[PDB]
Amino acid sequence: TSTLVRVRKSAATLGIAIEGGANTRQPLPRIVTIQRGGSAHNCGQLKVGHVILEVNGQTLRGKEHKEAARIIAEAFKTKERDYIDFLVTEFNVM
């Protein structure tokens, strides 16, 4: 139903694009691009079409597009850890 994917910061970029966010018909962001050479692509495990439920355990429910993108960018840039955990689904979660 849902998968926790740990992306190690193996490259200088994360290399994903997301669409949607709160107050749209795609209320949780969906991954639309995974760029070769970036940390996400290097990880084996994210897919175009994955919906991001949580970033490092923080729900994205309620976060409009720009804010969801800001949180993900901060999770990548922070020196708090050398990885980002994405909770994702290919379908829907109850």
Partner: peptide, 11 residues
């Protein structure tokens, strides 16, 4: 359309 952001381009 849905908004799209490339995370690496976030300022």
């Amino acid at each position: 359309g849905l908004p799209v952001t490339f995370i690496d381009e976030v300022d």
